[PDB]
Amino acid sequence: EVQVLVLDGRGHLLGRLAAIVAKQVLLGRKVVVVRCEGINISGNFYRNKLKYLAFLRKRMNTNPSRGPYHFRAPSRIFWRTVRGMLPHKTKRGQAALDRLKVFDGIPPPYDKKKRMVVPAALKVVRLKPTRKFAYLGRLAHEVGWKYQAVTATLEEKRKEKAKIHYRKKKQLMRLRKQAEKNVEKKIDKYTEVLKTHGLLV
Amino acid sequence: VFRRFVEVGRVAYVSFGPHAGKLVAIVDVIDQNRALVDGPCTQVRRQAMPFKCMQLTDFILKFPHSAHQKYVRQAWQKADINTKWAATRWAKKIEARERKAKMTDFDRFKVMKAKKMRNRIIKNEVKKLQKAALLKASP
Amino acid sequence: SGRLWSKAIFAGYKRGLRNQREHTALLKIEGVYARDETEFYLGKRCAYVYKAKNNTVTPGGKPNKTRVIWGKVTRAHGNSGMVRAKFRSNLPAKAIGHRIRVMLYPSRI
Amino acid sequence: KASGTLREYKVVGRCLPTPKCHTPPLYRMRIFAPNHVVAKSRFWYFVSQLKKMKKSSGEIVYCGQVFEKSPLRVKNFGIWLRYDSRSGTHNMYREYRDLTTAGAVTQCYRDMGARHRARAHSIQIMKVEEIAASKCRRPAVKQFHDSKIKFPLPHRVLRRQHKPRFTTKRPNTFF
Amino acid sequence: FLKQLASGLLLVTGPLVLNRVPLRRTHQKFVIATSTKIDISNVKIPKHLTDAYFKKKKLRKPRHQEGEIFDTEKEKYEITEQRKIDQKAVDSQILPKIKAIPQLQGYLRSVFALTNGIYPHKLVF
RNA sequence: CCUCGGUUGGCCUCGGAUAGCCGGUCCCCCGCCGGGGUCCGGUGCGGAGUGCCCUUCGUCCUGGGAAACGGGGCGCGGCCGGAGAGGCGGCCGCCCCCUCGCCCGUCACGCACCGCACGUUCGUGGGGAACCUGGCGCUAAACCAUUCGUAGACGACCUGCU
RNA sequence: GGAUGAACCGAACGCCGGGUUAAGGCGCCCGAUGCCGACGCUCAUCAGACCCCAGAAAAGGUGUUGGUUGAUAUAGACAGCA
RNA sequence: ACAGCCCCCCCGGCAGCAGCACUCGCCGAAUCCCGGGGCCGAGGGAGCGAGACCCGUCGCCGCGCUCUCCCCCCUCGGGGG
Ligand SMILES: [Mg+2]
Ligand SMILES: [Mg+2]
Ligand SMILES: [Mg+2]
Ligand SMILES: [Mg+2]
Ligand SMILES: [Mg+2]
Ligand SMILES: [Mg+2]
Ligand SMILES: [Mg+2]
């Protein structure tokens, strides 16, 4: 689409969400993934940590400063996964990669906006309930990410402010329902039209 | 925790497949995945049917398992499932979806006008209620 | 007064893995995500509208920067609402991931 | 032999008449096959194994599909078969619940492929029989012999995961 | 829509008082037929309203070969009194049938557009 | 003027669970709002993103409804909230406007350009030189050269100079 | 097509447009399953993942799933406690 | 029995019939009609006849009407049986 697609990374499987995001950005769409510390990986935490430690072991023997750059933030981990699914060594792939933004937590541009969900990448429907999974935030923290605590604190503050906003919205909606109850003699003429054509059961 | 159960006489709504949008009664259970299924008044002849395309309702009919069409149809007609289903909120939501989908361009225009006026009146009343509630002053 | 055309994305050319047939293009029409929904758009005119440096003549208007490569939808592609399009000239590769307008012009309804 | 939804075929054949017996005996088999061509091929395979017959030395006088005489009734099927594993041949008795005999045999082929990696060319179905619910031996079949059977559908996974592909609401699994 | 002409072009008049569309030809390939209809039976479409009637007229270029003085005159198309009379005659008997059903005149005054949520293949016209 | 083109309404946000959820309401506790225990509803999510909002032909006579405690100000001044990348949002006081804009009707008109494409928006777009027009404001450093030797292959670096 | 490859699998070649296939495929790279695909099996702190082909055996497992044969049991099995 | 299920009947009757209540096939001398999208337009003297003369509306194939006469139904001679 023409606007930015904001995806909440909580409860989403890494590779599934990354494949969807890669196709979206290749189709010329701006995608912003927030709360990348909430991304889940199937398989138990020790196995996933072993996978990332093997990735850490892969370095250039002659000069590690040139070698593979092992990014420790969950946002950068997800970004590298999407880059793995993109043709990043061509101009088209680099433009597609530039169309993607990743964040830990939800920063101020996007904490006041609705966030989409990709059901085809959700753990609840893609994973059996008996299986074990790992949290990307915990994996990143125990492999070297330094900002798990401050991100948690800022997320708690954001959740408090969102709770206040939601209480205000519920009060407004209650008042709207009361208003619809108050005026119905002057409303039933259009309510019947809406009910006839299927809007507003 | 669970309130709706797969059992003999349970009425299920067909979500997809060749019989989508119809009501059926569960006559028997086969191998954890299929059910012997019969809609005698909703025009679904007896056949096997997977549980994945079923959505259980709150109606349960009282007939023995693997009874014939006669007894299933009498159980359906007595305490008519069709009228009760049509009265439920589920079926009228389905009907609202259908009549919204089959709405023409002139109907869309008329709905736009009616919704415009309705929303404006409701918004004026909401503003009035907000101003009425704002006059709170008590130590 | 209104958009009057369906949005589509130039996804790419008809291709194998290692061969590319640039004479026909693959279009992703927005909101069309199944093959059975593509029948409406078959035969519809489609346009790749872009801007350039020099002014060109505009039919029924003053010259401006706008240029068009005209085309039309030929058949459905895949199972997921892709369509194939033939344009008068093969689409430039810089247009991949950009807007194509499906114009509704040869209406069958 | 590949598969699909198998069908039952009554196949009747005999040897060609010779100046040793003018009326050779007729032999009948039940063949579960995708189609009548495969049914005739399997009939010749089996009668070549059992009697001393060949397709060239004999003929098939009948090959007709056997329709299920009660496809509206759930019933229990016991299937005696033999198959070649990677390191031997074994006889098995399996049980299934189905409406049709051919469907039960198809279930058997899929289940043998799933549980024993047995391809359909390794499997010889030697007996299929409808059995009473009191003669069943497999608990997975016997547990459905309840006049008051009752169970919910606990964790209903969303299957329309791409319509819509992007949404605001997370799916519900409880219904 | 009123009638198909001899060339297959439709003759339409979304009445000029409603959306400024005169008695005018159009191509059936480039229109969308909606489901809403009015009963325009027993109205009198004039007989002279034909393809020859609606065919475009031109002035250039007799008595002039090389252009040194601009021949851009007459470029202002003129609405003929005959055309105005025909438009009035048709509209005077189409309009009462339009007013016979509620807010069809508002529907005809409005123009069609594609909202970002709506898709032409899912729309019933 | 020169150059770069994309785009063709918006959604201003609970936390989340999934072998469960969502909404509303009376009694207890804590600052007149929240958290618990009841009770009442909804749940193939209808307080529904399979959704919601806005909705572009424009005017002129012209009546009925909605409102009339109402909308507009690139109009002034003040206040508050927002720091994770606040680059944003909200509320008051004064002034100046129209009673129009929202629905259903009456009444006619507008280039009706004589079938035809790139139309329709963001948009007073981004970037660069330059002319005119006013008001309010500013009058600096860096480098070389010199010097230092905490430095040094050369660069670089640490320093000093009414 | 097999990522890659003289020999494998498909198929042999003038320059092109349209249609359809083979072998092989259809999460993303990368065309195509964005099917409300079917039935099961499997959790690996070296999982597994497709001819040639690019790594493994004997031997084990009270992991789990089927199957064969035999045995005991209301004349009360089995396991525990005495 | 205060539900039902299976088999044989002394025998069934009605409707429908590989069903427009989407349970399970193979087909078409036992097969026809209509519609939509896409790509294409290569060729260029076809006249046994007038003795051609406006550029051969021509061959094969399938049809209609007239050189017979009654009527019928709409238009006001034209159209349809
Ligand atoms: Mg190759
Ligand atoms: Mg290889
Ligand atoms: Mg080709
Ligand atoms: Mg591949
Ligand atoms: Mg693809
Ligand atoms: Mg038939
Ligand atoms: Mg030619």
PDB file of all heavy atoms in Angstrom, chain C residues 1-6 30-32 40-41 105 107 109, chain E residues 29-33 111-116 119-121 125:
ATOM      1  N   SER C   1     -12.048  13.992  -9.499  1.00  0.00           N
ATOM      2  CA  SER C   1     -13.090  13.765  -8.508  1.00  0.00           C
ATOM      3  C   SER C   1     -12.910  12.426  -7.803  1.00  0.00           C
ATOM      4  O   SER C   1     -13.375  12.242  -6.680  1.00  0.00           O
ATOM      5  CB  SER C   1     -14.469  13.831  -9.161  1.00  0.00           C
ATOM      6  OG  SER C   1     -14.628  15.028  -9.896  1.00  0.00           O
ATOM      7  N   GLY C   2     -12.234  11.489  -8.462  1.00  0.00           N
ATOM      8  CA  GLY C   2     -12.041  10.175  -7.883  1.00  0.00           C
ATOM      9  C   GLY C   2     -10.928   9.424  -8.569  1.00  0.00           C
ATOM     10  O   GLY C   2     -10.490   9.787  -9.664  1.00  0.00           O
ATOM     11  N   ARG C   3     -10.483   8.352  -7.912  1.00  0.00           N
ATOM     12  CA  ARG C   3      -9.318   7.618  -8.392  1.00  0.00           C
ATOM     13  C   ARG C   3      -9.611   6.885  -9.692  1.00  0.00           C
ATOM     14  O   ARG C   3      -8.776   6.866 -10.595  1.00  0.00           O
ATOM     15  CB  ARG C   3      -8.827   6.640  -7.332  1.00  0.00           C
ATOM     16  CG  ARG C   3      -7.744   5.727  -7.846  1.00  0.00           C
ATOM     17  CD  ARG C   3      -6.830   5.275  -6.748  1.00  0.00           C
ATOM     18  NE  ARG C   3      -7.558   4.938  -5.535  1.00  0.00           N
ATOM     19  CZ  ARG C   3      -8.202   3.797  -5.343  1.00  0.00           C
ATOM     20  NH1 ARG C   3      -8.248   2.865  -6.276  1.00  0.00           N
ATOM     21  NH2 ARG C   3      -8.809   3.585  -4.182  1.00  0.00           N
ATOM     22  N   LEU C   4     -10.758   6.217  -9.784  1.00  0.00           N
ATOM     23  CA  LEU C   4     -11.222   5.619 -11.036  1.00  0.00           C
ATOM     24  C   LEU C   4     -10.306   4.561 -11.647  1.00  0.00           C
ATOM     25  O   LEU C   4     -10.597   4.059 -12.735  1.00  0.00           O
ATOM     26  CB  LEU C   4     -11.472   6.707 -12.076  1.00  0.00           C
ATOM     27  CG  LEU C   4     -12.886   7.264 -12.095  1.00  0.00           C
ATOM     28  CD1 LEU C   4     -13.028   8.177 -13.264  1.00  0.00           C
ATOM     29  CD2 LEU C   4     -13.890   6.138 -12.186  1.00  0.00           C
ATOM     30  N   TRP C   5      -9.205   4.210 -10.988  1.00  0.00           N
ATOM     31  CA  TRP C   5      -8.387   3.094 -11.438  1.00  0.00           C
ATOM     32  C   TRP C   5      -7.952   2.269 -10.240  1.00  0.00           C
ATOM     33  O   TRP C   5      -7.784   2.785  -9.135  1.00  0.00           O
ATOM     34  CB  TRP C   5      -7.156   3.540 -12.246  1.00  0.00           C
ATOM     35  CG  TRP C   5      -6.416   4.737 -11.732  1.00  0.00           C
ATOM     36  CD1 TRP C   5      -6.518   6.012 -12.186  1.00  0.00           C
ATOM     37  CD2 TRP C   5      -5.415   4.757 -10.710  1.00  0.00           C
ATOM     38  NE1 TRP C   5      -5.676   6.834 -11.490  1.00  0.00           N
ATOM     39  CE2 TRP C   5      -4.983   6.087 -10.577  1.00  0.00           C
ATOM     40  CE3 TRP C   5      -4.855   3.784  -9.882  1.00  0.00           C
ATOM     41  CZ2 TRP C   5      -4.016   6.467  -9.659  1.00  0.00           C
ATOM     42  CZ3 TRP C   5      -3.899   4.165  -8.969  1.00  0.00           C
ATOM     43  CH2 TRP C   5      -3.488   5.493  -8.865  1.00  0.00           C
ATOM     44  N   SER C   6      -7.788   0.971 -10.472  1.00  0.00           N
ATOM     45  CA  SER C   6      -7.302   0.068  -9.444  1.00  0.00           C
ATOM     46  C   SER C   6      -5.790   0.150  -9.344  1.00  0.00           C
ATOM     47  O   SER C   6      -5.090   0.236 -10.355  1.00  0.00           O
ATOM     48  CB  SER C   6      -7.715  -1.370  -9.747  1.00  0.00           C
ATOM     49  OG  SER C   6      -9.073  -1.439 -10.123  1.00  0.00           O
ATOM     50  N   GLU C  30      -4.116  -4.708  -6.125  1.00  0.00           N
ATOM     51  CA  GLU C  30      -4.423  -4.640  -4.705  1.00  0.00           C
ATOM     52  C   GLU C  30      -5.821  -5.181  -4.432  1.00  0.00           C
ATOM     53  O   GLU C  30      -6.774  -4.873  -5.149  1.00  0.00           O
ATOM     54  CB  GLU C  30      -4.301  -3.201  -4.216  1.00  0.00           C
ATOM     55  CG  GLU C  30      -5.011  -2.918  -2.916  1.00  0.00           C
ATOM     56  CD  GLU C  30      -4.363  -1.804  -2.131  1.00  0.00           C
ATOM     57  OE1 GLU C  30      -3.612  -1.013  -2.733  1.00  0.00           O
ATOM     58  OE2 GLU C  30      -4.606  -1.721  -0.910  1.00  0.00           O
ATOM     59  N   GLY C  31      -5.935  -6.006  -3.395  1.00  0.00           N
ATOM     60  CA  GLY C  31      -7.201  -6.591  -3.018  1.00  0.00           C
ATOM     61  C   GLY C  31      -7.577  -7.849  -3.764  1.00  0.00           C
ATOM     62  O   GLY C  31      -8.623  -8.434  -3.465  1.00  0.00           O
ATOM     63  N   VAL C  32      -6.762  -8.286  -4.712  1.00  0.00           N
ATOM     64  CA  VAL C  32      -7.024  -9.475  -5.510  1.00  0.00           C
ATOM     65  C   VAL C  32      -5.974 -10.501  -5.117  1.00  0.00           C
ATOM     66  O   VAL C  32      -4.830 -10.439  -5.575  1.00  0.00           O
ATOM     67  CB  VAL C  32      -6.976  -9.175  -7.009  1.00  0.00           C
ATOM     68  CG1 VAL C  32      -7.453 -10.367  -7.799  1.00  0.00           C
ATOM     69  CG2 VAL C  32      -7.807  -7.961  -7.318  1.00  0.00           C
ATOM     70  N   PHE C  40     -12.353 -10.464 -13.397  1.00  0.00           N
ATOM     71  CA  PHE C  40     -12.848  -9.120 -13.660  1.00  0.00           C
ATOM     72  C   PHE C  40     -11.822  -8.299 -14.428  1.00  0.00           C
ATOM     73  O   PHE C  40     -12.177  -7.538 -15.332  1.00  0.00           O
ATOM     74  CB  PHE C  40     -13.207  -8.438 -12.342  1.00  0.00           C
ATOM     75  CG  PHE C  40     -13.590  -6.998 -12.489  1.00  0.00           C
ATOM     76  CD1 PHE C  40     -14.888  -6.647 -12.794  1.00  0.00           C
ATOM     77  CD2 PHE C  40     -12.657  -5.994 -12.318  1.00  0.00           C
ATOM     78  CE1 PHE C  40     -15.245  -5.330 -12.928  1.00  0.00           C
ATOM     79  CE2 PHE C  40     -13.011  -4.679 -12.460  1.00  0.00           C
ATOM     80  CZ  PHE C  40     -14.308  -4.345 -12.761  1.00  0.00           C
ATOM     81  N   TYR C  41     -10.549  -8.448 -14.089  1.00  0.00           N
ATOM     82  CA  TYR C  41      -9.496  -7.588 -14.604  1.00  0.00           C
ATOM     83  C   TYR C  41      -8.909  -8.064 -15.921  1.00  0.00           C
ATOM     84  O   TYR C  41      -8.027  -7.392 -16.460  1.00  0.00           O
ATOM     85  CB  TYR C  41      -8.379  -7.454 -13.571  1.00  0.00           C
ATOM     86  CG  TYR C  41      -8.846  -6.900 -12.252  1.00  0.00           C
ATOM     87  CD1 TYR C  41      -9.354  -7.731 -11.273  1.00  0.00           C
ATOM     88  CD2 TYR C  41      -8.780  -5.543 -11.989  1.00  0.00           C
ATOM     89  CE1 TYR C  41      -9.783  -7.230 -10.078  1.00  0.00           C
ATOM     90  CE2 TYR C  41      -9.207  -5.033 -10.792  1.00  0.00           C
ATOM     91  CZ  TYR C  41      -9.705  -5.882  -9.837  1.00  0.00           C
ATOM     92  OH  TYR C  41     -10.138  -5.389  -8.632  1.00  0.00           O
ATOM     93  N   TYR C 105     -11.259   0.425 -18.357  1.00  0.00           N
ATOM     94  CA  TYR C 105     -11.826   0.957 -19.598  1.00  0.00           C
ATOM     95  C   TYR C 105     -12.587  -0.079 -20.406  1.00  0.00           C
ATOM     96  O   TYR C 105     -13.748   0.185 -20.753  1.00  0.00           O
ATOM     97  CB  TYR C 105     -10.736   1.602 -20.461  1.00  0.00           C
ATOM     98  CG  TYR C 105     -10.229   2.928 -19.988  1.00  0.00           C
ATOM     99  CD1 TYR C 105      -9.082   3.478 -20.538  1.00  0.00           C
ATOM    100  CD2 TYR C 105     -10.887   3.632 -18.999  1.00  0.00           C
ATOM    101  CE1 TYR C 105      -8.601   4.687 -20.117  1.00  0.00           C
ATOM    102  CE2 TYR C 105     -10.413   4.851 -18.565  1.00  0.00           C
ATOM    103  CZ  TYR C 105      -9.269   5.375 -19.130  1.00  0.00           C
ATOM    104  OH  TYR C 105      -8.786   6.594 -18.709  1.00  0.00           O
ATOM    105  N   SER C 107     -14.888  -2.260 -20.178  1.00  0.00           N
ATOM    106  CA  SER C 107     -15.803  -2.801 -19.187  1.00  0.00           C
ATOM    107  C   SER C 107     -16.685  -3.868 -19.809  1.00  0.00           C
ATOM    108  O   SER C 107     -17.218  -3.687 -20.906  1.00  0.00           O
ATOM    109  CB  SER C 107     -16.662  -1.692 -18.589  1.00  0.00           C
ATOM    110  OG  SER C 107     -17.542  -1.163 -19.558  1.00  0.00           O
ATOM    111  N   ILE C 109     -19.072  -5.198 -17.631  1.00  0.00           N
ATOM    112  CA  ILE C 109     -20.162  -5.224 -16.672  1.00  0.00           C
ATOM    113  C   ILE C 109     -21.062  -4.014 -16.866  1.00  0.00           C
ATOM    114  O   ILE C 109     -20.722  -3.072 -17.580  1.00  0.00           O
ATOM    115  CB  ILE C 109     -19.635  -5.278 -15.236  1.00  0.00           C
ATOM    116  CG1 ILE C 109     -18.821  -4.025 -14.931  1.00  0.00           C
ATOM    117  CG2 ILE C 109     -18.789  -6.516 -15.029  1.00  0.00           C
ATOM    118  CD1 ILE C 109     -18.461  -3.886 -13.486  1.00  0.00           C
TER     119      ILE C 109
ATOM    120  N   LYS E  29     -18.501   0.049 -24.450  1.00  0.00           N
ATOM    121  CA  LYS E  29     -17.310  -0.563 -23.885  1.00  0.00           C
ATOM    122  C   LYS E  29     -16.763   0.265 -22.734  1.00  0.00           C
ATOM    123  O   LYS E  29     -16.178  -0.289 -21.800  1.00  0.00           O
ATOM    124  CB  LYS E  29     -16.253  -0.739 -24.970  1.00  0.00           C
ATOM    125  CG  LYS E  29     -15.485  -2.038 -24.895  1.00  0.00           C
ATOM    126  CD  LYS E  29     -14.426  -2.108 -25.978  1.00  0.00           C
ATOM    127  CE  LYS E  29     -13.793  -3.487 -26.042  1.00  0.00           C
ATOM    128  NZ  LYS E  29     -12.618  -3.517 -26.954  1.00  0.00           N
ATOM    129  N   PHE E  30     -16.962   1.581 -22.771  1.00  0.00           N
ATOM    130  CA  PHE E  30     -16.372   2.500 -21.808  1.00  0.00           C
ATOM    131  C   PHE E  30     -17.387   3.004 -20.788  1.00  0.00           C
ATOM    132  O   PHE E  30     -17.258   4.117 -20.278  1.00  0.00           O
ATOM    133  CB  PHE E  30     -15.726   3.675 -22.535  1.00  0.00           C
ATOM    134  CG  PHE E  30     -14.671   3.267 -23.514  1.00  0.00           C
ATOM    135  CD1 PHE E  30     -14.992   3.009 -24.829  1.00  0.00           C
ATOM    136  CD2 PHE E  30     -13.359   3.138 -23.118  1.00  0.00           C
ATOM    137  CE1 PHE E  30     -14.026   2.629 -25.726  1.00  0.00           C
ATOM    138  CE2 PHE E  30     -12.389   2.759 -24.014  1.00  0.00           C
ATOM    139  CZ  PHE E  30     -12.724   2.508 -25.319  1.00  0.00           C
ATOM    140  N   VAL E  31     -18.410   2.206 -20.489  1.00  0.00           N
ATOM    141  CA  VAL E  31     -19.384   2.540 -19.461  1.00  0.00           C
ATOM    142  C   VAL E  31     -19.571   1.335 -18.555  1.00  0.00           C
ATOM    143  O   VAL E  31     -19.263   0.198 -18.915  1.00  0.00           O
ATOM    144  CB  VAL E  31     -20.747   2.977 -20.036  1.00  0.00           C
ATOM    145  CG1 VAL E  31     -20.595   4.197 -20.918  1.00  0.00           C
ATOM    146  CG2 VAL E  31     -21.395   1.841 -20.788  1.00  0.00           C
ATOM    147  N   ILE E  32     -20.086   1.601 -17.360  1.00  0.00           N
ATOM    148  CA  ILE E  32     -20.461   0.564 -16.410  1.00  0.00           C
ATOM    149  C   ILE E  32     -21.967   0.634 -16.233  1.00  0.00           C
ATOM    150  O   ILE E  32     -22.505   1.684 -15.866  1.00  0.00           O
ATOM    151  CB  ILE E  32     -19.749   0.735 -15.063  1.00  0.00           C
ATOM    152  CG1 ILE E  32     -18.260   0.448 -15.205  1.00  0.00           C
ATOM    153  CG2 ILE E  32     -20.358  -0.184 -14.026  1.00  0.00           C
ATOM    154  CD1 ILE E  32     -17.481   0.723 -13.953  1.00  0.00           C
ATOM    155  N   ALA E  33     -22.647  -0.474 -16.492  1.00  0.00           N
ATOM    156  CA  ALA E  33     -24.093  -0.544 -16.341  1.00  0.00           C
ATOM    157  C   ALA E  33     -24.410  -0.919 -14.901  1.00  0.00           C
ATOM    158  O   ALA E  33     -24.102  -2.029 -14.457  1.00  0.00           O
ATOM    159  CB  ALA E  33     -24.691  -1.551 -17.317  1.00  0.00           C
ATOM    160  N   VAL E 111     -20.741  11.833  -8.342  1.00  0.00           N
ATOM    161  CA  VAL E 111     -19.847  11.181  -9.289  1.00  0.00           C
ATOM    162  C   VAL E 111     -19.264   9.935  -8.639  1.00  0.00           C
ATOM    163  O   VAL E 111     -19.183   9.816  -7.414  1.00  0.00           O
ATOM    164  CB  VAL E 111     -18.720  12.112  -9.774  1.00  0.00           C
ATOM    165  CG1 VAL E 111     -19.288  13.261 -10.579  1.00  0.00           C
ATOM    166  CG2 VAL E 111     -17.926  12.626  -8.597  1.00  0.00           C
ATOM    167  N   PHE E 112     -18.850   8.995  -9.480  1.00  0.00           N
ATOM    168  CA  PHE E 112     -18.311   7.727  -9.015  1.00  0.00           C
ATOM    169  C   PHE E 112     -16.819   7.846  -8.743  1.00  0.00           C
ATOM    170  O   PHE E 112     -16.100   8.555  -9.449  1.00  0.00           O
ATOM    171  CB  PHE E 112     -18.570   6.630 -10.044  1.00  0.00           C
ATOM    172  CG  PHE E 112     -17.941   5.318  -9.700  1.00  0.00           C
ATOM    173  CD1 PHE E 112     -18.471   4.523  -8.705  1.00  0.00           C
ATOM    174  CD2 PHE E 112     -16.823   4.875 -10.376  1.00  0.00           C
ATOM    175  CE1 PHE E 112     -17.896   3.316  -8.388  1.00  0.00           C
ATOM    176  CE2 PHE E 112     -16.246   3.668 -10.062  1.00  0.00           C
ATOM    177  CZ  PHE E 112     -16.785   2.889  -9.067  1.00  0.00           C
ATOM    178  N   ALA E 113     -16.358   7.146  -7.709  1.00  0.00           N
ATOM    179  CA  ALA E 113     -14.961   7.191  -7.313  1.00  0.00           C
ATOM    180  C   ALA E 113     -14.595   5.883  -6.633  1.00  0.00           C
ATOM    181  O   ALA E 113     -15.460   5.153  -6.147  1.00  0.00           O
ATOM    182  CB  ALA E 113     -14.683   8.366  -6.376  1.00  0.00           C
ATOM    183  N   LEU E 114     -13.300   5.597  -6.596  1.00  0.00           N
ATOM    184  CA  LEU E 114     -12.789   4.409  -5.926  1.00  0.00           C
ATOM    185  C   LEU E 114     -12.149   4.824  -4.607  1.00  0.00           C
ATOM    186  O   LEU E 114     -11.098   5.470  -4.593  1.00  0.00           O
ATOM    187  CB  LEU E 114     -11.796   3.660  -6.811  1.00  0.00           C
ATOM    188  CG  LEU E 114     -12.385   2.903  -8.003  1.00  0.00           C
ATOM    189  CD1 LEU E 114     -11.332   2.051  -8.675  1.00  0.00           C
ATOM    190  CD2 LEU E 114     -13.547   2.041  -7.563  1.00  0.00           C
ATOM    191  N   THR E 115     -12.799   4.466  -3.507  1.00  0.00           N
ATOM    192  CA  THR E 115     -12.260   4.606  -2.166  1.00  0.00           C
ATOM    193  C   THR E 115     -11.153   3.573  -1.959  1.00  0.00           C
ATOM    194  O   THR E 115     -11.103   2.544  -2.634  1.00  0.00           O
ATOM    195  CB  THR E 115     -13.385   4.426  -1.142  1.00  0.00           C
ATOM    196  OG1 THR E 115     -14.500   5.240  -1.523  1.00  0.00           O
ATOM    197  CG2 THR E 115     -12.953   4.834   0.253  1.00  0.00           C
ATOM    198  N   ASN E 116     -10.244   3.863  -1.023  1.00  0.00           N
ATOM    199  CA  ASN E 116      -9.095   2.983  -0.831  1.00  0.00           C
ATOM    200  C   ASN E 116      -9.479   1.616  -0.279  1.00  0.00           C
ATOM    201  O   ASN E 116      -8.670   0.685  -0.354  1.00  0.00           O
ATOM    202  CB  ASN E 116      -8.056   3.641   0.080  1.00  0.00           C
ATOM    203  CG  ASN E 116      -8.648   4.169   1.360  1.00  0.00           C
ATOM    204  OD1 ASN E 116      -9.712   3.736   1.793  1.00  0.00           O
ATOM    205  ND2 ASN E 116      -7.950   5.108   1.983  1.00  0.00           N
ATOM    206  N   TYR E 119     -12.969  -2.320  -3.940  1.00  0.00           N
ATOM    207  CA  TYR E 119     -12.312  -2.910  -5.092  1.00  0.00           C
ATOM    208  C   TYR E 119     -13.363  -3.220  -6.148  1.00  0.00           C
ATOM    209  O   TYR E 119     -14.421  -3.779  -5.820  1.00  0.00           O
ATOM    210  CB  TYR E 119     -11.555  -4.176  -4.694  1.00  0.00           C
ATOM    211  CG  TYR E 119     -10.541  -3.921  -3.616  1.00  0.00           C
ATOM    212  CD1 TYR E 119     -10.704  -4.443  -2.345  1.00  0.00           C
ATOM    213  CD2 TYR E 119      -9.428  -3.141  -3.866  1.00  0.00           C
ATOM    214  CE1 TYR E 119      -9.780  -4.204  -1.361  1.00  0.00           C
ATOM    215  CE2 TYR E 119      -8.504  -2.894  -2.889  1.00  0.00           C
ATOM    216  CZ  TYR E 119      -8.682  -3.427  -1.637  1.00  0.00           C
ATOM    217  OH  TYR E 119      -7.753  -3.180  -0.658  1.00  0.00           O
ATOM    218  N   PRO E 120     -13.115  -2.878  -7.412  1.00  0.00           N
ATOM    219  CA  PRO E 120     -14.164  -3.021  -8.434  1.00  0.00           C
ATOM    220  C   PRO E 120     -14.632  -4.446  -8.655  1.00  0.00           C
ATOM    221  O   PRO E 120     -15.777  -4.647  -9.074  1.00  0.00           O
ATOM    222  CB  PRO E 120     -13.500  -2.443  -9.688  1.00  0.00           C
ATOM    223  CG  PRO E 120     -12.053  -2.572  -9.442  1.00  0.00           C
ATOM    224  CD  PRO E 120     -11.859  -2.369  -7.980  1.00  0.00           C
ATOM    225  N   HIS E 121     -13.790  -5.445  -8.403  1.00  0.00           N
ATOM    226  CA  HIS E 121     -14.226  -6.821  -8.591  1.00  0.00           C
ATOM    227  C   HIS E 121     -15.134  -7.308  -7.474  1.00  0.00           C
ATOM    228  O   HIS E 121     -15.903  -8.248  -7.688  1.00  0.00           O
ATOM    229  CB  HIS E 121     -13.018  -7.746  -8.731  1.00  0.00           C
ATOM    230  CG  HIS E 121     -12.303  -8.014  -7.446  1.00  0.00           C
ATOM    231  ND1 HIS E 121     -11.447  -7.103  -6.869  1.00  0.00           N
ATOM    232  CD2 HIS E 121     -12.297  -9.100  -6.639  1.00  0.00           C
ATOM    233  CE1 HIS E 121     -10.955  -7.612  -5.754  1.00  0.00           C
ATOM    234  NE2 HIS E 121     -11.454  -8.823  -5.593  1.00  0.00           N
ATOM    235  N   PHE E 125     -22.648  -3.642  -9.054  1.00  0.00           N
ATOM    236  CA  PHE E 125     -23.090  -2.386  -9.633  1.00  0.00           C
ATOM    237  C   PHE E 125     -24.575  -2.440  -9.954  1.00  0.00           C
ATOM    238  O   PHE E 125     -25.073  -3.447 -10.455  1.00  0.00           O
ATOM    239  CB  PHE E 125     -22.282  -2.064 -10.885  1.00  0.00           C
ATOM    240  CG  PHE E 125     -20.924  -1.504 -10.596  1.00  0.00           C
ATOM    241  CD1 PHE E 125     -19.809  -2.321 -10.602  1.00  0.00           C
ATOM    242  CD2 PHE E 125     -20.761  -0.163 -10.313  1.00  0.00           C
ATOM    243  CE1 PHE E 125     -18.559  -1.810 -10.338  1.00  0.00           C
ATOM    244  CE2 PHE E 125     -19.514   0.353 -10.046  1.00  0.00           C
ATOM    245  CZ  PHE E 125     -18.411  -0.473 -10.059  1.00  0.00           C
TER     246      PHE E 125
END
